[PDB]
Write a protein that binds this ligand. Sequence first.
Ligand SMILES: CCCCCCCCCCCCCCCCCCCCCCCCCC(=O)SCCNC(=O)CCNC(=O)[C@H](O)C(C)(C)COP(=O)(O)OP(=O)(O)OC[C@H]1O[C@@H](n2cnc3c(N)ncnc32)[C@H](O)[C@@H]1OP(=O)(O)O
Ligand SMILES: CCCCCCCCCCCCCCCCCCCCCCCCCC(=O)SCCNC(=O)CCNC(=O)[C@H](O)C(C)(C)COP(=O)(O)OP(=O)(O)OC[C@H]1O[C@@H](n2cnc3c(N)ncnc32)[C@H](O)[C@@H]1OP(=O)(O)O
Lengths: 132, 132, 315, 315
Amino acid sequence: KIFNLFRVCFISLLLIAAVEYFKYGTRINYEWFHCTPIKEPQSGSVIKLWARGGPSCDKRGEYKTIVKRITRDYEPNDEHLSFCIIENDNVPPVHYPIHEDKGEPGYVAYVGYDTDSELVQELCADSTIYHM
Amino acid sequence: KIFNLFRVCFISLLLIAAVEYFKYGTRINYEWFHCTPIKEPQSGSVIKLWARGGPSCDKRGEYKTIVKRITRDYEPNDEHLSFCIIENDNVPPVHYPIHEDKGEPGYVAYVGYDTDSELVQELCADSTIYHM
Amino acid sequence: IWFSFREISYRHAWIAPLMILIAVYSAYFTSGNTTKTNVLHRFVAVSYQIGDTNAYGKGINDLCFVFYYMIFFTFLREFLMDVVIRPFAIRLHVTSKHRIKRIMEQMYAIFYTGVSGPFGIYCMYHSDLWFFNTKAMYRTYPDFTNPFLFKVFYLGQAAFWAQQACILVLQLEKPRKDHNELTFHHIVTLLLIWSSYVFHFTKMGLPIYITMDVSDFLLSFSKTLNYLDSGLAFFSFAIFVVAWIYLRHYINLKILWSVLTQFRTEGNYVLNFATQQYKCWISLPIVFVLIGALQLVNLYWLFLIFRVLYRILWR
Amino acid sequence: IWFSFREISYRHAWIAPLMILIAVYSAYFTSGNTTKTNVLHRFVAVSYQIGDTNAYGKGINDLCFVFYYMIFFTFLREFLMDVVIRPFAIRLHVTSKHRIKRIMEQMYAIFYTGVSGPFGIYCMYHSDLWFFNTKAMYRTYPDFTNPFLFKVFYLGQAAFWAQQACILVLQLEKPRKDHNELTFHHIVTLLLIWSSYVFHFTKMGLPIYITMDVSDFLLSFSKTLNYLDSGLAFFSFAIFVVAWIYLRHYINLKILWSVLTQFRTEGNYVLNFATQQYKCWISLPIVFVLIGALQLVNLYWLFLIFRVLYRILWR
Ligand SMILES: CCCCCCCCCCCCCCCCCCCCCCCCCC(=O)SCCNC(=O)CCNC(=O)[C@H](O)C(C)(C)COP(=O)(O)OP(=O)(O)OC[C@H]1O[C@@H](n2cnc3c(N)ncnc32)[C@H](O)[C@@H]1OP(=O)(O)O
Ligand SMILES: CCCCCCCCCCCCCCCCCCCCCCCCCC(=O)SCCNC(=O)CCNC(=O)[C@H](O)C(C)(C)COP(=O)(O)OP(=O)(O)OC[C@H]1O[C@@H](n2cnc3c(N)ncnc32)[C@H](O)[C@@H]1OP(=O)(O)O
């Protein structure tokens, strides 16, 4: 009678909150639902990062997924990485065609390490190089 | 007899996995356990980001928390933000004294918008400015 | 004075909710300021007013408002039903217990349906959705903020159905013939209210309220007028057959086809999780399933209604 | 042939696990390659060997190995106990049912304890922790990879206790005097194995195994030798009183004080979640609570033992 009532009142509220956390949770981090990080390994431990998605992969999404990949695939307590993030300027913030020939990417990053830091420095023509 | 056995076998395994997800989960994103984002609002919508933590707040942690704050406190589908991340070079990657007078920060960011983009451009003396 | 008090309050069952809400109302109105900075204001009014325009957003205050109206609707129910309805019923001379307790429960359905029926139609009049215009339900889909009245109708009804769902769980006593299809009814009414309110398809939810209220009002009217002596209550059966037919069936078959056809080709159809617009190729199945479940139950009530039409007329 | 087979296999209860493990072993050894690229290798060997050195890491293969050894230890138990132990017991002439089924269960505890007792001591000999040197348990705390043997001892014992915990849940029949303190025993043995193995305090877990095995071996030895005719089993009681006293008490009081004092001032004491080193001011309470629970139960068994010492001697 009453137990039943309170138990249903707490599953309904649990599910109210579970769906509120779907919205919030997928909204704050959407860079993974729409943007797929494509990495093109160069000669050594240097790999070139970017992202490929629909029109929902704006420059912010590309930047977040590049940063996530750079800080999650490389451990700087082994040795230290050194990366540069290169913006493509001839591009509006929302630029990917929804279809399948996407085009140029908004943000292109060359991540690296320190044993071949020279290579990263040379690939990053004039952009600032960030050390972690 | 047997139900009891299988039910205990599944809570033990649930908790084995719950703790494996504590390790993984707190390891991939530790920038929030150790680094506290301190923002110093400038004149307008420009605020200056950095981080303050223990020796566990290395330059990678500061960069991740700055990026998280920049991409989570500003919505670029309203209007577009424009930020620069400035590295402090006279600093080893692990530099915060564990105690309480921390010192200079590894990464300092000036985030902004576009109605006062000039101010951000002027505060970012020569570092590259990233648009989202 | 004390156990006289529990017996007194055992009889009547509106006194405790009345005390609670009168205390809250009094404390809110006598504190002087009635601005948003209170706490009683989070509970006794719609929160979230955007700036100083008329468009209110969504949050947890909404849950506080919904719960406090549960408390208010309970008192209403009991007050009304017992105080006016029981007394008018026993003026009436129809005197028994399947017939009177069930006329009494109808009697409160027509009260509230008259109030909600017209509130809802009125609310869709002052808008862009006049006479269920589907083009409009989606022409601007995200809707992170609806209006005053419309937000109030929406949560006034979550406040009202929630509580009835909670009263039929609380296990009053006797269902019988129904409680099964009627529980399908309650749970789906509540998921549509919650879903639609929270995922921003509120202008989808507004038309369906109009259909349900305007049809159910006439249904309960006929049921009461039959429970008493009839005279004409069969004119209320024609009328309810046509209100129900047009409203629930045609109305929602056109809204359901609106869903396939114009969810796609209207508004913004990219998933775009960051802007919180979920009108995409994934949510279309879910929306169609929900309104399809409503339409299934409604033809199930249509079979009950049509069985009764040839039955009664031909027996 | 079939129901003769279920009766046959009902009698004996080792045949099904024997079949399972012989099939797996045969399939692994006859496939030719025995390198890490199989699947049977994930189950019939310790995985994770780092490069081509001798230091193995941690993962889910470890769970597969632990489960397959559950399967192997069950068969062992049953095979052993029934085949050798039941037969030697009924050579013995001690003939009854509280005494023989309980001598039989002791009899298997001394078998395995002799094996585990020495494996563990041997494993700590080839290391830096010789004769419980606390300085060493933490001098290098994270330990993301232990050695071969040591990883095997660790998971060989998770494989062994897990399964016994599962057999005492499975509800065999009769506990009586104990099962309560003994269940505290089982659950805490298992959380320490799991915890310590997975949070990298494995060199903490190694000394405690030595104490438990070397004391329990002598305990079960005395219990068997008493269950039979005695002769001298009272020399096995002195010996067990001193093995137990030194080992469980002094041994762990010194490890527990090692925990306050040298968890702090040894190794790295910053929390540093990114390096996965949790030796900090937060984990010290948890570690102290766990070994304190072990020490509580051990003085509780010490009260049982000391009650029995003045009792028996003075009655
Ligand atoms: C990937 C991204 C993810 C994104 C994902 C995106 C997810 C996206 C999610 C997005 C979601 C989208 C949002 C959309 C959702 C919107 C919200 C919805 C809100 C809903 C609110 C709902 C509205 C509110 C609810 C309400 O309002 S409450 C619920 C409504 N339910 C009803 O109302 C029950 C209907 N029930 C019946 O219809 C009865 O079942 C009924 C039997 C037919 C009655 O018929 P009756 O009415 O019984 O009529 P009679 O009175 O009987 O009269 C006639 C009497 O003539 C009598 N006779 C006369 N001569 C004779 C005679 N010579 N011989 C024999 N009989 C004779 C005879 O006796 C008879 O009667 P008899 O004796 O036979 O019974
Ligand atoms: C913020 C960051 C977060 C980070 C957080 C960080 C979190 C960090 C987490 C980090 C975690 C850190 C990791 C650390 C954990 C390490 C892993 C642990 C692994 C554990 C493995 C454990 C080891 C393996 C387990 C095993 O191995 S199994 C469990 C062991 N348990 C036991 O073994 C039971 C003990 N039990 C007893 O001690 C008995 O209770 C007992 C009664 C005393 C027996 O005494 P008894 O032995 O009974 O001896 P008697 O035979 O009786 O002999 C004498 C007989 O003299 C008889 N008498 C002779 N004359 C007389 C006479 N004139 N008058 C009267 N009686 C007479 C008399 O009858 C008597 O006997 P009576 O008849 O009276 O009974």
